[PDB]
Ligand binder design. Structure first.
Ligand code: QWJ
Ligand code: QWJ
Ligand code: QWJ
Ligand code: CA
Ligand code: CA
Ligand code: CA
Ligand code: CA
Ligand code: MN
Ligand code: MN
Ligand code: MN
Ligand code: MN
Lengths: 232, 232, 232, 232
């Protein structure tokens, strides 16, 4: 079996294991700050530098995976706390969409909300143009920020949030468990055929965005991942 | 919302938060040892003492949950390393089945392998009477030790194993991720309608069993859990 | 170490974490209403269903605890705003005293004011029979509603009150901080040996009561708790 | 009654409500970073700019206070994780001691460990020169970093820690409750006569330090305080 495994308790801007895109900075505490609070339509993304083979064209086998991460979203004076963080999977050549308007796109899609990615979004603003639910929500995205499925959620300013994601290759189920600061758990699961929607080699990471009036602190505190693909 | 949450880094005898059934002891290091190595048809079970409201007859709402645990199985001289550990969910009045033969029953079912429980087993012996797969396996059980689904696995003697379980109430999906000592991840997921198979109030826990010639060390090292039920 | 931790932002009828005693109801907003406004000598109590091992006869170690809660007391037309709320600790088998006269007993003691409990009272009526101070007060109680110590306080009708309680096992100090509506804080601290006054296993809760003439709305809005016992 | 109350969910560089001393900075996320990882014997402190009248020469009354804060300590590559954070109270004119050697002096004392302050230290290095206990600890300090009392503790790298402090003026008791990442609570309480050790008006704040080989990240995430002094 072919396995990719890593653990990040902290992040350093110098390290080759991570690719930094757009307005991403690394704070002295080791946290990744995805958006620039003084920039209009700010977009920042982070990717694990090594491409992970999630399926085989030779065997037809799809990898399984377990991944855990922690993030923080914090309000800033005068600006609307927007637009959120997206944990995404995309082709290895992925870049911030050209002429990105940030905001509702979450740095992974065009103005119409279309892209080439599979993701778990932690959306803190209601964009009617992408048919967003009325409140804060966790969503399962397939090539669009117009979510396949959403679950009502609450983004608490300055709160540390824990996420656990299981992708079972046999049932093609993407399961998400989100642990809020008040102790409650929020789940969302969706059948997503990764072979049909993504290439053999993909990159995994995080993305966040803001606008002119919609800005907030987007932080990635830690990340652990382990994926296994059967080669027999 | 109604939430039940706990975290056990260690265990202690006399902790009113845990119900001890059968042959369970607590070691000096804080580990729970489920089976008695000197007893025939040894059965040991640990339950979280407080019943959990996994669904409401008034609203029709079902609870989602997230749990993590770590266990160890270790071989003993002369005896066949058997029979394994099962993480289970059952009605609050649950007891070791009367006249339990232990062994392949994993302490949750009768001689025919029938019971009233939903569980995730970590099976180290192949019982033909319960149509077990030929090698060690992780299985999803619904009122039977004749698993609804199995996945090939390997129980390494003296190895610490990490498990992560997500239940999404909306899709009724029970998802499992098992982190092996060789670094690989093993997953298994199954749609299980907890509202159709179990009463409103349930107990969560662990069970292990042995036979005359099939005995091993069954250890529960740690356990965290969080469940949320949306209320009217 | 052995830790018990819970958080209630709201309450619900049928939640197995809460034992309801006497005249307690749960309002639609999630608040617990401890007394029946149309009943004479009304007594209502709520207990955390799981017994907490506050000390061990095996090691001699005593647990430390941190708890926070919010309550509301509101005057009702024609009746004397009485009698108050008590946050208490008692043996796991605790029940409303048989033939309870309510009123000044605060639902935890007999007519003479004697009982088996340790508590923090928020007294709104001066009972000369229990040597109450002349004004509203916060009191620390040890097997009696004739307080070991009191501090002058003011119960404002319809005001939300925040309480923070720290018990340090090493110094045996029970410390209380009460945050009034107008922003002011009221404190009271007392050395209380829980190992000498209470059994190893207890229950934690709230109690309120009234008389024929003395009646008011007694509400428990939220409650958080964490206790740690060193298992050397 | 005379009450001082404030709440900081975040911090900002252009805020006249806070005095910044030494090597302290404000990160873009709003966190206060007390020490400079690139500086030898680094010292940084933050104070609430308004002096708080903790006792009256006119009435002889002493204030009671309730404060809550959250911090983070994180290890840095190659350097020994040191020296820790101290929550302190000192005369309004307080400055970093002249020619501060950083290290075990926690930025509040001279080389011999003497100063003019009352504090709660979260010590992560054992200094034999100040008779430190062998492991990480929480300590109650009175004009010395050679603690009046200590309690064993564990500083977990990258973990968010919550603290609750109650000072009861009548019993002169300073009570501390520390909530660790793993859920456990650590307490320490000590009788400290603030009227005898500190002047009428005082300043409250935080301090941290480092040395040549002993450095780590020291962060103050949030701070809430309320003091009430009876003026009758
Ligand atoms: C050759 C060959 C195969 S040996 C099979 C032996 O099975 C046991 S019971 C059996 O024990 C197993 C441990 O090995 C497991 O614990 C099973 O769950 C339990 O059902 C009988 O008692 C013996 O008579 C017999 O030899
Ligand atoms: C004169 C004079 C003073 S009025 C005192 C009255 O006390 C009540 S009981 C009393 O009621 C109080 C409410 O006011 C409180 O609830 C007390 O806890 C409870 O013990 C008697 O029944 C009456 O007969 C009597 O007049
Ligand atoms: C021998 C031996 C054991 S190593 C001790 C080293 O201590 C430092 S100072 C010391 O540094 C510590 C960090 O490790 C802490 O910051 C202390 O508060 C600070 O006082 C000296 O400069 C070195 O010469 C010496 O090697
Ligand atoms: Ca949106
Ligand atoms: Ca079997
Ligand atoms: Ca009274
Ligand atoms: Ca030190
Ligand atoms: Mn959305
Ligand atoms: Mn099986
Ligand atoms: Mn009283
Ligand atoms: Mn010290």
């Amino acid at each position: 079996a072919e396995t990719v495994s890593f653990n990040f308790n902290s992040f350093s801007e110098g390290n080759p294991a991570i690719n930094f895109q757009g307005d991403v900075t690394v704070l002295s505490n080791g946290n990744i700050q995805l958006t620039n609070l003084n920039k209009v339509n700010s977009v920042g993304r982070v990717l694990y530098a090594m491409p992970v083979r999630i399926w085989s064209s030779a065997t037809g086998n799809v990898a399984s995976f377990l991944t855990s991460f922690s993030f923080e979203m914090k309000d800033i004076k005068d600006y609307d706390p927007a637009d959120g963080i997206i944990f995404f999977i995309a082709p290895e050549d992925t870049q911030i969409p050209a002429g990105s308007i940030g905001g509702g796109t979450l740095g992974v899609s065009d103005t119409k909300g279309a892209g080439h990615f599979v993701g778990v979004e932690f959306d803190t603003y209601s964009n009617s143009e992408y048919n967003d639910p009325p409140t804060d929500h966790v969503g399962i995205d397939v090539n669009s920020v117009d979510s396949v499925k959403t679950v009502p959620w609450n983004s608490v300013s300055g709160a540390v949030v824990k996420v656990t994601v299981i992708y079972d290759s046999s049932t093609k189920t993407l399961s998400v468990a989100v642990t809020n600061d008040n102790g409650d758990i929020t789940t969302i699961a969706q059948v997503v055929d990764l072979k049909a929607k993504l290439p053999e080699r993909v990159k995994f990471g995080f993305s966040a965005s803001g606008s002119l009036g919609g800005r907030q602190i987007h932080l990635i505190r830690s990340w652990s991942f382990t994926s296994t693909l059967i080669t027999t």
